[PDB]
Write a protein that binds this ligand. Sequence first.
Ligand SMILES: O=S([O-])[O-]
Ligand SMILES: O=S([O-])[O-]
Ligand SMILES: O=S([O-])[O-]
Ligand SMILES: O=S([O-])[O-]
Length: 337
Amino acid sequence: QSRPASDPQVVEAARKEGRLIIYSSTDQSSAQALLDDFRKLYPFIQIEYNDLGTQAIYDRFVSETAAGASSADLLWSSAMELQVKLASEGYALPYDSPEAKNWPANARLGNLAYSTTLEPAVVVYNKRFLKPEEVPTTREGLARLLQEPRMRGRVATWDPERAAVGFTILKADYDRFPAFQELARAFGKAQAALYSSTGAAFEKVISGEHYLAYGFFGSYALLRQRTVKDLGIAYLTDGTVAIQRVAFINKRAAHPNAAKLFLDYLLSLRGQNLMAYTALIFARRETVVGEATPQALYKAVGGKDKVYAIPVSTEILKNLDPAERMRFLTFWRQAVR
Ligand SMILES: O=S([O-])[O-]
Ligand SMILES: O=S([O-])[O-]
Ligand SMILES: O=S([O-])[O-]
Ligand SMILES: O=S([O-])[O-]
């Protein structure tokens, strides 16, 4: 009674194909509960989940296509600019998902590509070193905290010159909030350590070598929290940037119909519910109940209007323009060094 909306013609064509090839940036052990639940709904589809770096998904999909090859049926990546680039250059199958009827216009590239998540950039901190009542929830507050000599060497954030997703998050921050400029000069004052990888930043927070990290995903934070009780999460109340992992179907899928079923599943309440609950990835669908959900995010930040979703839109391709990147990175490098 929670099966996704399904074209019966699409289900029947997927019975015949019997195969689904995914290229995904989402760790298989996060995706596993979705793949297993999907296989239980459509036990007649054999799935090949390829768990890849976001740059590799792009480089690989572009070669197989250009060499004329059988490539993925479905592409699922947190690299929003690369997905929106492919989907706006002839790589995407147009499909109107029946589970996406209430997606906002800024969560879908028309019928080319869909948001599957709404993941906040948050603050994480080590409760042994910073109590919750002293962790500020505004950029101005963080900039003040980072003047304190006890915080020198105790801050982590992204290196937006080595992490594509860190670029996207810090750039959205810089474009939307003037107080980001104050904060970035404070990263400089505090000698912030910059990380290309969430894992290496968290390791240092958990050890107490950093006390606080800025701009990492809520989904990852919650996942680490489940096993690490010293890990605190604070949500920004002056304004929160959110990432949307983007899914689209290969225009040239050998199994377009199996990809349609999987895409519909990912967007369905059943799939988004299971994602929130098992993977602790923050859902896109507003009707999901639990901690990793739009409703929970909106209450934590003090209202929906305090979340700026990075849109599933060609507008974000300005992030790939050399002069646009340059202005941000020159401000960034002057501020944090
Ligand atoms: O779930 S694994 O077998 O693709
Ligand atoms: O770029 S490495 O840190 O994933
Ligand atoms: O690439 S993420 O793990 O920082
Ligand atoms: O208190 S925990 O949500 O950081």
